[PDB]
Structures are given as structure tokens and as C-alpha cells.
């Protein structure tokens, strides 16, 4: 097989910027090179064919480019609608294989993650199990870390998180981290705590609830 | 116009099969080169299939190659896939697509998903993520859902039942183990949820679940009205005392250790502490070796003094006194007991054999009768050479006619044990007997 | 020591007479003279009157000169002071006083107190006063108790019936409306106030009223639950009524009459005659012919209520109901009693010939084994050729180790009447029996 | 009859000063006099008689003088143990009258009344009525007013406050201060204010109880 690879894997940069994917080949392919744009959630669009060929639609901003074994693909003036991830694809020869991908992010002014604390539900709790769950929303970068922790300040590892997808309007990310544990063991504590560190602030923001009253 | 729907394939366990068929329309399908093309959970895209303009020459890749087979059918304009064997590896999302050019894939359909999976499929559960106790009063009352354990994927979360989809956030279904946690958080603004509701709405298609969990503001741990067997000008009578003699059995044996105990029933679990004092013939014997210590019980406290006694003690009618004290009592309860004086008359022991209408059955039964005997204190048992004998039984002495004492003690045996003869005795234990021992037998 | 105590005071209408008594012990009386001296509420003292040694010398003041008559009994010590038209003016407090010699009381009484008023007595209120309920805790916890609305003067107030002394205050009651008004604060010490009762102790001659509030304290409002809906008083103590099922005999024999009792015990002369009230599963089984005895013991009367049942009543687990009534019940008391629901099984009834080594003595021992039955109820006898043998003794039924009982009847007799053959037969009635009745019989 | 006359009807002096009570009559009574000392809630005691005869068990410090027409009785040194009426009876002829007596206070160091209210007993409620007492406890001088307030400032008329005598240990007085509503009119209000004004502070002693809890 012909291993395509792509560069880098994740990209940002400026509305406007112009910015440049790339990639290579194990064997030569000549000029056999596609270009795909799939925007998440929607199906990908064919973007260039023949290395360079631009395929209907794609206003001049794009560009394809290269021969033998490295091509490259540059977008000028970044219009919001570029916002994908993008994959090359050899058609020189079986397999066809694609490169991986090299994924789209908008750069923005970083912003202040607003966190939320959520004690077990009644309902979960007479079914025998406790999650509390936390909502790190919007904020920019994606970059943050929390932790949790139970009586005093005491960590833990049984967590699951989950962030979303840079946001379409917002261009901001969002984070649901949550602990579960068993009832019993839920009950055996006190206070629980949801401690988020982030480039915005210097003092990790916390948001804290005491079991002694729900 | 030219749009491709593939379409089928749903979920199927390994080593099962699919057919995936994909609706070409808007061209002469029937000049053209077709893909087949799956694209991983993980994001990565796969080539799956290629096929020539009227079938014939067809191309797989060495993964798929032997399980798969690509096909179309220049008519109805329908490419197809038919996948077998199934590994796990194939799970992913899959896409026809056309060769608009020289090897590209110009047009592509809208896709459809296939998770092979030993698992089976599970009904998610809901919940209601109310803010804090702790009412975070301010504008931004950010709320949220989790919906845990259901599979597989994927499930359709809306607040209000879509009314509401200004300020929500949706995050992306995690596996954690054969089962998936999704939640969804929703922000609002301006005094208008507690007024107007708010429910999470959620449907999961393979298990036909449609569920809306209202979310109800967070209220306080406390519920009211306990018991109503009417407090009446009730109340309990206090701790109580009770004394017992030792067994005859331990008294009458040199090597056994006869005690004298005096239990305290009803004791508060808030004083649990209580004075017992012994007194053997009103001379106080603090400690002797009295041994107290606690039972808890159906809700109460019961205390257990057990004081050791010289065997020639008892015999000689000392006056064992117990005397209990604690806070509670308006004055302290004693008990006392000794020996009851009286005569005295050895019983006469005889062992009766089964009744001859009774051999037939498995098991007989065996009677040993005792009589003419005071004081009612005494101890039979049954004994098969040597080893104290079980499945005996034992009347309660009855007062006879000439104010003597009888009773009897029932042993069932298995009938082969009885003819092949064997040392089955009555064994007497009474205060009136030559050395406080007789043994009865059958001479046979 | 010398004492005056003085007594009789109280209240009395305008117009009406009353009479001192000054009971004096601690000198010769004879040798003085005394005196009566009264005090007005607003605290000017009045001298009363004066009489010589012996009695024949008298002087008043003109306010009082004619309605009263100061008098001696010099052969009892005690001074007097009858008063006939009283005002309310000769309201005061009383002093008898002896002379010292030199024209001066040397010695005064502890004073009585007279109120002329047309106001009736009225006994007090006592209200334990416990401080806010929003705990001011501190160091010094006062504490106190209003006594509202009492008459005439005056009323004791102690705390700790007399201990409690220090930090205590009370106060000058004072009247509004013919109502007479009091107050006493303590203030106590920190220490842990609910720890010592501390009671309000407060006694009021005049209507010999003696009353002990505790001060308990102000606990936090909402918390528990009211009484759930607990009606007027459904009990007390005073007589009692037991419930008796008839001999298992009696029913299982139709010829036998079968009987439930009734039995009321402790009443006494004041309360007669009692209801009685019988109803079969509650059917009006309006006293059917219920004979009721009432009869004579310890020092109280015991009625003894006699229901005839049907036989067949009884054995179909029907409900027998006794209601008890009479004027001191607060509500009436009614047992019940009813036939268990219980497995059943047949007694395996057999007859033990004397043992073989006791064909010496003039008596024998004939034993009736009963085995396997269900339930315990039962009934077994001796007979001799058709009447009730006399002399023979049941055991108790006791539990067997699988779930069914046994039990023995034994039966002595004169060795001549079993050698010589006579109809010694062991008799059982149990409910699981052919007619109810076995009876098997011996041989030789 | 004969009158007697006292002079004055009340003095307070500081422990350990000189007094001098009279008494006079009307007529001639040569040397016919006593001195009894009632102290509060206790019986009269002879102190002195015939002038100044000094009668058993009363001590060095009291000395009677004077005959003829006008008395005089003399405490020397003042201590607590001699708050009490004082009076002065004679006995030349009959009846026997005495003076109006002679009430003594103690002028000892100013103290600060320690005030509680308390609000009615729910045994007292039952009944019908309600009495909110307020105990203004140890404190000198005698002079101090109370006032009571019911919601927020409102002043009332239907109070009954009490007296003590100056105490004998620590010569200060009591009071006891009772506003007595019906339990209906005592519920249509809510906060209840005893306010006490006192030589000892400038701002008045206040405490308050509000019925929203008990
Ligand atoms: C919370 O629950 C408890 C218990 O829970 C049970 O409750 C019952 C109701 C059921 O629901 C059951 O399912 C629950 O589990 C409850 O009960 C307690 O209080 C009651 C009274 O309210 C009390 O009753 C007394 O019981 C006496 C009999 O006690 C013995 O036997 C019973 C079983 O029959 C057993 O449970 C006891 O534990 C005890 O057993 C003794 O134990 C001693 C040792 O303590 C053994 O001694 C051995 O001997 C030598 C050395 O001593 C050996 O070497 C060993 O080392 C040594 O251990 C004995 O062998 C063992 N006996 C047996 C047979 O195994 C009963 O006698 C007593 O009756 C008196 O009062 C009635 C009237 O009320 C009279 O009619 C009686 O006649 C008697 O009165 C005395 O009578 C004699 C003549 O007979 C007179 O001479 C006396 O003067 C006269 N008065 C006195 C003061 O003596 C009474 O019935 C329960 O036993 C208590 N429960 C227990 C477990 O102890 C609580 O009340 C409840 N809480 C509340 C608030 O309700
Ligand atoms: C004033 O004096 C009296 C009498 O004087 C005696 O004083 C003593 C000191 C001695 O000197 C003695 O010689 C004197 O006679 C005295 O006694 C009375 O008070 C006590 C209570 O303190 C009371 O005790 C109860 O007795 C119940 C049984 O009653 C029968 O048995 C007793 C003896 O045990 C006997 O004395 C009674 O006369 C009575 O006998 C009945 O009599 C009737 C008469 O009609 C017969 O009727 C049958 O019915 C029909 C037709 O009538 C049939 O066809 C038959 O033909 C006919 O005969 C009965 O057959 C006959 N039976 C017998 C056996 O003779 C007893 O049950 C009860 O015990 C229960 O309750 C206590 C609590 O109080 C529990 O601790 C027990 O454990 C038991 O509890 C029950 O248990 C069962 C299961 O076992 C449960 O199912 C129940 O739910 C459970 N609870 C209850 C509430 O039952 C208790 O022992 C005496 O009966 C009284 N005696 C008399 C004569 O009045 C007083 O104390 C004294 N008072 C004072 C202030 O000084």
C-alpha cells in the first residue's frame, strides 16, 4: 500500500490567514491527489482532483499543489465555512487511501469557563448509584484541566469527560466531566469539589457543594 | 439532482452479515465507476470498494477482501455491499460514492452507520440535573440531563421538545464499557424557569424509549409524620430482673462449674451501665468472679450477671440475693433464691421397649419412665455406648397422685439399630440416688 | 427558744366574724400580758389590744373597740382574738405580741393574714417562664414563673421545693381587678440548666392549692408531628377482661356443651353491675343466653360471662367476641379468641404393658404413648370397662423433632386387676380421629 | 390619744455613716419609748426600749437617746445588714401607738440592671391569654423606667411592673415589668420590645423577642 501522510493533524489560525496543509507519500503518485472537505456533521466534498484541478464551487481561495510524493493545499482568507477537517487522498494506484486528516480551528480571544456543579438526582440516588456531574462551559482555549475532589481536597480518578466541537457562533469549546460512584460510598463524605485550571485565570476556579442538605 | 442514498444496515452482532444498498439518481448511473468507502468512529477514512462500469472487474482491499462483495444492478440504480463475516474492525460509518474523474470520489451519498457488537442493547436511564441546594441565584441558571447506560448509539436529546435550543450544549456519547453516557446542559436567562417548566426529552430508537424527566428546583432533606399507634399517656415499666437456679446437672458433678445468674432486661441503650451486686447469705461477695456483660437486642439492652458457685454452697441453702441499682430506679431491685427445702426420694428407672405393633416401621421408638422421685429437679438424657445419645426427648415432670414426681423420655431409633441390639441407656441424674447416678439398660 | 405562731387567718366578707388563735410555747405563759397588733397592707402598724395575766383587764382602741374581744386560755398557752363586724378596713396582718415588761413587744409571732373582702377565692395559675427560644446562652440563664390570678394574699413561691435560695427574686404581687398577680425570676447559674430540674413550687392557702411547674425548655417550632388524630381515651387502668376457649373435649363431643368465657376482673362496690356483649364473627348475638355470675374474693368482685357455642361454630374458626362496659371505662374493651388455622395429623396412639422387672410390687405401671399429632390440642383418658378409670396422669404435650407432638398418660394400678385381665383402655379424642375418638385397648 | 411623729419618712445614706431617726409625741411620755427595725418581708424586732435600754442580741452599734418629748435613735457605723423600716412606739399610756417608721437605703455604687424578656408559656396561650414578662434584675439606683413596644415603636398603657426592696447582700433592686394582652391580640403583632432607661448607660437597655419563631 501507499501510506499517504498529512500535516500537522490539527491546525488554528486568524480569520483571513492564510494557511497551509500538506502531504506525502511513501511511493510516488504522480499528480493523483484529491483534496476532501468535510465540515462536522455534513458528508465531504470533493475540494481538488489532479493535485492542483479545483473542483466546482470552491471559490479561488483554495489551492492544490505539488507532484511525486508531497502536494500541498492552501486556503487563503479563511472564511468560516473552511472549518473542517480536511484529507488527501492518492489515486495512483490500489488501495485508494487517504492521509488521516488535518483538522480546522478558528482562533479566538481566550474567555472565562462558566462551571457548574450538580449533586445526584433524588431518582439516580433510589436507584443506587451517585454521579456528579460538572459543566465547564464555554471557553477558549480547549486547553483546561479539572479534577475533582471529595472530603477537604482529596483527588480522584474515576472520572469521565467529554468536550464538544469548537462551537459554530461562539467559537468557544465546552467540557462535561463526571464522577460516579455508588450510593453508599457517596454518602460516606461530606464536601465535593470541581476544580477547573485554565490560561484565563491564575486561581483555578472552583465551585463546591456540601452533602449536608441535599 | 444527482444524489446518492445508501441506506439499511443497522446493528448485527460479529461473524453476522449486512447487505448495504446505495439509490443512485440525477445521472446515467450506468456509465459510471462506484466506491464504496467507510469512515471510522475514530474519523479515519477507509477504502472499501471499487467496481467496474457494468460489473465484472471489482477491487477490494486485502481487509475486506473474501468478506466483502461490491455489486449493482444498472436499473433499478442501486450499488450494493454485501459484507459477511463480520469482524469488529468493519464497524464504521459507510458511504457510496462515484468517480467523477480520474480516481475521485466527486459525489458521495449521505452515509449509514453499522457497529458490529457482541452486546446487547440497553434502555438508557435519565436524569434531572436540578442546580445546587444551595440556590446559585444570579441570571445564567445553567441546568442539564444525564442520560446513562443505553446502547448503542445514538439517541436524540431536546429540551422543551425542541422549543428550547437557544443556550444548550450536547456532549458527545462516551463508551464506557458495552454502555454509553451522554449529557446535555442548558443555560437560561431572565426570571423564567421556575415560573415555566423545563423538561429533558430523550429517545433512544432501539429500544423504542421516549422519556421526559421535568426538571424539578432541588428541595430540602425532610419529610414529616412517624408514628401513630397513638402516644397515649403511655410509658414503660422500667428494667426488670429475673433470677435462675443452676442446673441440677452442674450442682450434682464434682467436675462441672454450677453458676448462679440474674439477667436485667429492659435496659436503656442511653445507661447501659448498671450496678449489680451479688450477695451470697447477705454477706457481699463484690466480684467472686461474678461475671456481667451486655446483649444488645429488638431494640433494647439485656444484662447477663453470672456468679460462680461452690457446688456444697447451694446444698447447704445459702440465700443467693442480686441486687441490681441504676439511675432511673427509685429504688434498687434485688431478687433472691435458694434450694428449696423439702424431701427427698430417688426415682425408679425403667426403660420400655417399642410396642410390638410398631416393628414395621423404619423407626421405633424407645421409653424410659421415671418415677416416685422429689424434689421435681432432675436430668435424664439417653446414651449409645458412651456418646450422649441425640433425637430423645424429654417430657416436663408431672406431679403423681402421692406427691411424688414422674416423667419420661422418648428415643426414636432406626428399627436395624434396635434388633442388631444395641447400648441404648437412660441416663438419671437426681439428688436422691447412691452417688447422684443410676444407668438403665436393656438386657439384651 | 420563745414562739408565737398565730393562725385563722383568711378571708371574710364585710360584716362577718372571725376568730385568732396565737398558740404560744416557750415561757410561763401566765406571767405576761399580751397583745395583738396589726399591720395594714400599706405597712402602718396598729396596736389592737391588751389583757392582764389573768384576763380581767382589757383595752381597745376606738377603731376597734366593741367588734373585737382579745381573750387567753392560760391552761393551753393560746392568746385568741375574735372579730364581729369586719370592714375591709381591718384588713392587715396579725400580730399577737408578748410583753416584755417595760411598756414594748419583745416578742413577736409570724403574723396571719386577713383579708375582708366581698371577692371570692380564686385559685392561681402557675406558668413556667422559660427563656426565648432563640437560646441566649451565656452565663447567667435566668429563669422564672408567673403565678396570675389568685385571691386572697399570700402564695409561696420556692424553687426546688425549698433548695434553690441564691439569685432568686420575687415579687411584691399586686392585684388588678380583684386578681392578684406574682412573679419570681432565678437567675441560675450557666452549668447546663436542663440538667437539674429546676421547678416553680407554689402553694395557695386559702383554696389549698399546691402546684409543680417544671420549666422545661423552649424548643425550636416544626420539626415532629401532632398526634395523628388520636381520639378521646380508648383505655386505662381498672378492671380487665380475659378470653378463654372451651376444652378441646367439650366441642369435639357432640354430646359435651361447649363454652366460651369471659372473665372481668378487679371492680369494686361503687362500680356494680357490668355490660356484657357477645357477637359471633360481630353478629348480634344478642346476650344468647349468657349467663353471667358475679362473684366474691380478695376485697374486689370478678364477672364471669358464659357463651354456650355450637360446636360446629367453634371448629369453622368463626370469631368470638366479648365486649366489656360500664361508666369508669374511658372506651369499652373487647377480646377475641378463635380456633388457629393448623395442620393436621392423627395421633398414633399405642399401650406399654408394665416392665417385665416390675412384676414384684403391688402396683403396676400402665403407660398410654401418643405420638405424631397435630395440632397440641388434645384430650386423653383412662377407662375401665366403660367408666373413667381414676388414677392415672397426663404429661403435657411436648413438641416432637419433626413438628408433630407426643405425649404420655400413665396409670397405676394393683398388679391383681392386670394379671387377672380387666379392660384397662387408653382413651384419646383429637379433632384428627375417625368420630374424634380412638381408644385402643391391651391384650394380657 | 397620743401621736407620734417620725422624721423623715425615708433616707438613704452610704454605709458606714451616722444616723440619727427621731420620734415625738404629743404629750409628755417621760422615758416610755421603743425602737423596733422591721426589715422587709420579716417580722418587727425590738431594738431598744424605755429611752435607750438596749434590748438582747441587738448589737453595740444602735443607740437609743433622748427623754421627755423627741427620741433619737443612732446607727453607728451603717451596714446592709440594717436595711430595713425603722419604728418608734410608746408606751407611757394606752393604746399603744407608733410612728410612721423610717424606710433606709443604702447609697452604694451605680450598677447596670441586667434585663430578659420573655414571651408567654404555651400552657398559658392555651388558657387565653398572654403576659410578656421583663426582668430588669439587680441594679441602682431605684430610679429607672421601663416602656414597653410592640411592633417596630409603638409605646402601651396596660402594663404591671413590681418592686423590690433594696436586697440586703448586694443593696440593689429588682423589677419585674408585665404587659398581659389576649392571645388573640397578642398575634396580631409580632415583635416585642421591653426598653429600659438608666443612670447607668445613655443609651437605653434594650431587648427584643420576635413571636415568627416561638
Ligand atoms: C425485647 O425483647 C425481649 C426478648 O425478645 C423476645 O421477646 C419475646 C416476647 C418473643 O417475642 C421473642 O420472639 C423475642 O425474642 C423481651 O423479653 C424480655 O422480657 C420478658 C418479660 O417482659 C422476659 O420474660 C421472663 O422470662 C422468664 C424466662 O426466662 C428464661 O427463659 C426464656 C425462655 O423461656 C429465655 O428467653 C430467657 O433468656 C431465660 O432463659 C434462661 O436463661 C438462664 C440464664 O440467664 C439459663 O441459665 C442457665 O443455667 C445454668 C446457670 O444458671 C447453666 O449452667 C447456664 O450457664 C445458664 O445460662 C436458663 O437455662 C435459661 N432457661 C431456659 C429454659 O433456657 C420467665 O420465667 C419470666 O416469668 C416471670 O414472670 C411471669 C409474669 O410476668 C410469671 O408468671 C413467672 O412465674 C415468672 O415470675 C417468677 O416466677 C417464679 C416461679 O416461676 C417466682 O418464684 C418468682 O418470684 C417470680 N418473679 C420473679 C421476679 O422471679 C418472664 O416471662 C423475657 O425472658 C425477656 N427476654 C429475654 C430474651 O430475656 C423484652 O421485654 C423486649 N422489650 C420490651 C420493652 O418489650
Ligand atoms: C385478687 O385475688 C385474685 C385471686 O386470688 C389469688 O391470689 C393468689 C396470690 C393466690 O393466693 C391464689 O390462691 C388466689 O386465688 C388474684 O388473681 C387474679 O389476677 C391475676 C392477674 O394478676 C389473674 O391472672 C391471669 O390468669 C389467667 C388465667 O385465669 C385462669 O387461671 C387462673 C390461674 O392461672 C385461675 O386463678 C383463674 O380462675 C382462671 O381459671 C379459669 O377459670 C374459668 C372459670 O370460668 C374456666 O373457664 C372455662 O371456660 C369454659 C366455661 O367456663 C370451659 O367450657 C371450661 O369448662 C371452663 O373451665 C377456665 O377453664 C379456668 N382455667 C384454668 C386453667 O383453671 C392467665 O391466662 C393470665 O395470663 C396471661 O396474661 C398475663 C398478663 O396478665 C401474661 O403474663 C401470661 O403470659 C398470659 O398471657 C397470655 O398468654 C396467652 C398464651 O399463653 C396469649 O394467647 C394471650 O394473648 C396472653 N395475654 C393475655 C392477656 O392472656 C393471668 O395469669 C388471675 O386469673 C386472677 N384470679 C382470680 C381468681 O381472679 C388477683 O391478682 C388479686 N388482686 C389483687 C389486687 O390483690
Known amino acids: 500500500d501507499i501510506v499517504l501522510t498529512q500535516s500537522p493533524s490539527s491546525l488554528s489560525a486568524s480569520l483571513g490567514d492564510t494557511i497551509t496543509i500538506t502531504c506525502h507519500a511513501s511511493?510516488?503518485?504522480?499528480?493523483?491527489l484529491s483534496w476532501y472537505q468535510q465540515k462536522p456533521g455534513n458528508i465531504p466534498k470533493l475540494l481538488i482532483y489532479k493535485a492542483s484541478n479545483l473542483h466546482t464551487g470552491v471559490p479561488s481561495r483554495f489551492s492544490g499543489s505539488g507532484s511525486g510524493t508531497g502536494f500541498t493545499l492552501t486556503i487563503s482568507s479563511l472564511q468560516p465555512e473552511d472549518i473542517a477537517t480536511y484529507y488527501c487522498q492518492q489515486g495512483q494506484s490500489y488501495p485508494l487511501t487517504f492521509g488521516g486528516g488535518t483538522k480546522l480551528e478558528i482562533k479566538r480571544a481566550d474567555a472565562a469557563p462558566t462551571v457548574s456543579i450538580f449533586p445526584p438526582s433524588s431518582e439516580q440516588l433510589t436507584s443506587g448509584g451517585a454521579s456528579v456531574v460538572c459543566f465547564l462551559n464555554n471557553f477558549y482555549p480547549k486547553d483546561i484541566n479539572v479534577k475533582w475532589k471529595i472530603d477537604g481536597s482529596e483527588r480522584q480518578n474515576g472520572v469521565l469527560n467529554s468536550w464538544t466541537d469548537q462551537d459554530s457562533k461562539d467559537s468557544t469549546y465546552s467540557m462535561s466531566s463526571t464522577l460516579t460512584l455508588t450510593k453508599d460510598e457517596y454518602e460516606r463524605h461530606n464536601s465535593y469539589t470541581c476544580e477547573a485550571t485554565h490560561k484565563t485565570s491564575t486561581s483555578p476556579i472552583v465551585k463546591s457543594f456540601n452533602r449536608n442538605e441535599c | 439532482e444527482v444524489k446518492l442514498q445508501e441506506s439499511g444496515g443497522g446493528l448485527v452482532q460479529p461473524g453476522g452479515s449486512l447487505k448495504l444498498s446505495c439509490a443512485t439518481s440525477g445521472f446515467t448511473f450506468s456509465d459510471y465507476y462506484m466506491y464504496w468507502v467507510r469512515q471510522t468512529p475514530e474519523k479515519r477514512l477507509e477504502w472499501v470498494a471499487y467496481?467496474?462500469?457494468?460489473?465484472?472487474?471489482?477491487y477490494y482491499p486485502d481487509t475486506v477482501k473474501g468478506r466483502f462483495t461490491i455489486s449493482r444492478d444498472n436499473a433499478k440504480n442501486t450499488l450494493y455491499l454485501q459484507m459477511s463475516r463480520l469482524k469488529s474492525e468493519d464497524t464504521a460509518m459507510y458511504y457510496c460514492a462515484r468517480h467523477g474523474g480520474y480516481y475521485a470520489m466527486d459525489y458521495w451519498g449521505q452515509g449509514t452507520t453499522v457497529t458490529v457488537s457482541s452486546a446487547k442493547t440497553t434502555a438508557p436511564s435519565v436524569y434531572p440535573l436540578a442546580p445546587v441546594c444551595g440556590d446559585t441565584t444570579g441570571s445564567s441558571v445553567t441546568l442539564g440531563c444525564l442520560v446513562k447506560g443505553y446502547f448503542p448509539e445514538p439517541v436524540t436529546l431536546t429540551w422543551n421538545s425542541g422549543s428550547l435550543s437557544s443556550g444548550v450544549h450536547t456532549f458527545p456519547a462516551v463508551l464506557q464499557s458495552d454502555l454509553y453516557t451522554l449529557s446535555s446542559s442548558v443555560t437560561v436567562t431572565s426570571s423564567t424557569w421556575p415560573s415555566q417548566s423545563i423538561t429533558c426529552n430523550v429517545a433512544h430508537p432501539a429500544s423504542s424509549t421516549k422519556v421526559d424527566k421535568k426538571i424539578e428546583p432541588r428541595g430540602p432533606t425532610i419529610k414529616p409524620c412517624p408514628p401513630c399507634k397513638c402516644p397515649a399517656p403511655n410509658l414503660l415499666g422500667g428494667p426488670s430482673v429475673f433470677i435462675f437456679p443452676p442446673k441440677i446437672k452442674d450442682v450434682l458433678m464434682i467436675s462441672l462449674s454450677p453458676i448462679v445468674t440474674c439477667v436485667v432486661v429492659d435496659v436503656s441503650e442511653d445507661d447501659p451501665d448498671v450496678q449489680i451486686s451479688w450477695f451470697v447469705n447477705n454477706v457481699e461477695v463484690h466480684t467472686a468472679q461474678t461475671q456481667t456483660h451486655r446483649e444488645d437486642y429488638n431494640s433494647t439492652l439485656r444484662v447477663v450477671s453470672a456468679l460462680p458457685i461452690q457446688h456444697q454452697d447451694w446444698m447447704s441453702g445459702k440465700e443467693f440475693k442480686c441486687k441490681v441499682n441504676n439511675k432511673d430506679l427509685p429504688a434498687p431491685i434485688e431478687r433472691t433464691i435458694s434450694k428449696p427445702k423439702g424431701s427427698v426420694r430417688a426415682p425408679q428407672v425403667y426403660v420400655l421397649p417399642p410396642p410390638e405393633e410398631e416393628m414395621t416401621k423404619k423407626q421405633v421408638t424407645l421409653t424410659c419412665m421415671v418415677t416416685d422421685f422429689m424434689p421435681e429437679d432432675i436430668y435424664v438424657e439417653w446414651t449409645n455406648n458412651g456418646k450422649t445419645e441425640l433425637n430423645y426427648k424429654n417430657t416436663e415432670p408431672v406431679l403423681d397422685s402421692d406427691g411424688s414426681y414422674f416423667m419420661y423420655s422418648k428415643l426414636r431409633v432406626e428399627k436395624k439399630n434396635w434388633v442388631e441390639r444395641n447400648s441404648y441407656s437412660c441416663s438419671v441424674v437426681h439428688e436422691g440416688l447412691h452417688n447422684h447416678h443410676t444407668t438403665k439398660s436393656f438386657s439384651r | 427558744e420563745v414562739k408565737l405562731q398565730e393562725s385563722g387567718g383568711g378571708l371574710v366578707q364585710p360584716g362577718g366574724s372571725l376568730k385568732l388563735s396565737c398558740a404560744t410555747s416557750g415561757f410561763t405563759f401566765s406571767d405576761y400580758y399580751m397583745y395583738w397588733v396589726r399591720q395594714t397592707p400599706e405597712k402602718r402598724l396598729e396596736w389592737?389590744?391588751?389583757?392582764?395575766?389573768?384576763?380581767?383587764?382589757?383595752?381597745?382602741?376606738d377603731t376597734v373597740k366593741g367588734r373585737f374581744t382579745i381573750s387567753r386560755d392560760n391552761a393551753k398557752n393560746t392568746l385568741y382574738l375574735q372579730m364581729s363586724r369586719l370592714k375591709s378596713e381591718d384588713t392587715a396582718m396579725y400580730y399577737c405580741a408578748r410583753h416584755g415588761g417595760y411598756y414594748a413587744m419583745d416578742y413577736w409571732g409570724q403574723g396571719t393574714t386577713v383579708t375582708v373582702s366581698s371577692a371570692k377565692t380564686t385559685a392561681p395559675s402557675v406558668y413556667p417562664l422559660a427563656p426565648v427560644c432563640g437560646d441566649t446562652t451565656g452565663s447567667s440563664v435566668t429563669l422564672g414563673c408567673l403565678v396570675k390570678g389568685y385571691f386572697p394574699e399570700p402564695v409561696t413561691l420556692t424553687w426546688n421545693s425549698g433548695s434553690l435560695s441564691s439569685g432568686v427574686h420575687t415579687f411584691p404581687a399586686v392585684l388588678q381587678s380583684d386578681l392578684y398577680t406574682l412573679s419570681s425570676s432565678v437567675t441560675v447559674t450557666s452549668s447546663t440548666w436542663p440538667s437539674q430540674s429546676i421547678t416553680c413550687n407554689v402553694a395557695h392557702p386559702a383554696s389549698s392549692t399546691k402546684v409543680d411547674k417544671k420549666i422545661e425548655p423552649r424548643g425550636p417550632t416544626i420539626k415532629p408531628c401532632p398526634p395523628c388524630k388520636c381520639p378521646a381515651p380508648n383505655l386505662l387502668g381498672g378492671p380487665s377482661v380475659f378470653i378463654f376457649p372451651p376444652k378441646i373435649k367439650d366441642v369435639l363431643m357432640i354430646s359435651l356443651s361447649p363454652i366460651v368465657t369471659c372473665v372481668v376482673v378487679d371492680v369494686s362496690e361503687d362500680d356494680p353491675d357490668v355490660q356484657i356483649s357477645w357477637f359471633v364473627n360481630n353478629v348480634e348475638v344478642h346476650t344468647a343466653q349468657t349467663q353471667t355470675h358475679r362473684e366474691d374474693y380478695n376485697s374486689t368482685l370478678r364477672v364471669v360471662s358464659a357463651l354456650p357455642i355450637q360446636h360446629q361454630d367453634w371448629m369453622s374458626g368463626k370469631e368470638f367476641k366479648c365486649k366489656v362496659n360500664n361508666k369508669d371505662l374511658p372506651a369499652p374493651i373487647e377480646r377475641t379468641i378463635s380456633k388457629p388455622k393448623g395442620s393436621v395429623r392423627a395421633p398414633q396412639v399405642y399401650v406399654l404393658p408394665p416392665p417385665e422387672e416390675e412384676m414384684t410390687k403391688k402396683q403396676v405401671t400402665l403407660t398410654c404413648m401418643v405420638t405424631d399429632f397435630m395440632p397440641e390440642d388434645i384430650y386423653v383418658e383412662w377407662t375401665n370397662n366403660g367408666k373413667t378409670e381414676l388414677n392415672y396422669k397426663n404429661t403435657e404435650p411436648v413438641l416432637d423433632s419433626d413438628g408433630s407432638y407426643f405425649m404420655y398418660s400413665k396409670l397405676r394400678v394393683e398388679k391383681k386387676n392386670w394379671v387377672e385381665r380387666n379392660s384397662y383402655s387408653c382413651s384419646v379424642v383429637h379433632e384428627g380421629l375417625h368420630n374424634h375418638h380412638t381408644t385402643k385397648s391391651f391384650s394380657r | 390619744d397620743i401621736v407620734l411623729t417620725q422624721s423623715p419618712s425615708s433616707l438613704s445614706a452610704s454605709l458606714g455613716d451616722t444616723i440619727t431617726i427621731t420620734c415625738?409625741?404629743?404629750?409628755?411620755?417621760?422615758?416610755?419609748?421603743?425602737?423596733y427595725q422591721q426589715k422587709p418581708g420579716n417580722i418587727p424586732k425590738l431594738l431598744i426600749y424605755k429611752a435607750s435600754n438596749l434590748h438582747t442580741g441587738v448589737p453595740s452599734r444602735f443607740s437609743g437617746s433622748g427623754s421627755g418629748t423627741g427620741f433619737t435613735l443612732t446607727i453607728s457605723s451603717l451596714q446592709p445588714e440594717d436595711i430595713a423600716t425603722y419604728y418608734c412606739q410608746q408606751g407611757q399610756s394606752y393604746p399603744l401607738t407608733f410612728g410612721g417608721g423610717t424606710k433606709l437605703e443604702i447609697k452604694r455604687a451605680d450598677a447596670a440592671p441586667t434585663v430578659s424578656i420573655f414571651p408567654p408559656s404555651s400552657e398559658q396561650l392555651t388558657s387565653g391569654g398572654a403576659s410578656v414578662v421583663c426582668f430588669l434584675n439587680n441594679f441602682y439606683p431605684k430610679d429607672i423606667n421601663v416602656k414597653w413596644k410592640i411592633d417596630g415603636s409603638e409605646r402601651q398603657n396596660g402594663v404591671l411592673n413590681s418592686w423590690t426592696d433594696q436586697d440586703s447582700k448586694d443593696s440593689t433592686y429588682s423589677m419585674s415589668s408585665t404587659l398581659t394582652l389576649t392571645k388573640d391580640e397578642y398575634e396580631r403583632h409580632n415583635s416585642y420590645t421591653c426598653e429600659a432607661t438608666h443612670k447607668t448607660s445613655t443609651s437605653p437597655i434594650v431587648k427584643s423577642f420576635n413571636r415568627n419563631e416561638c
Open positions: 511511493q510516488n503518485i504522480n499528480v493523483w
Open positions: 467496481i467496474s462500469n457494468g460489473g465484472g472487474s471489482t
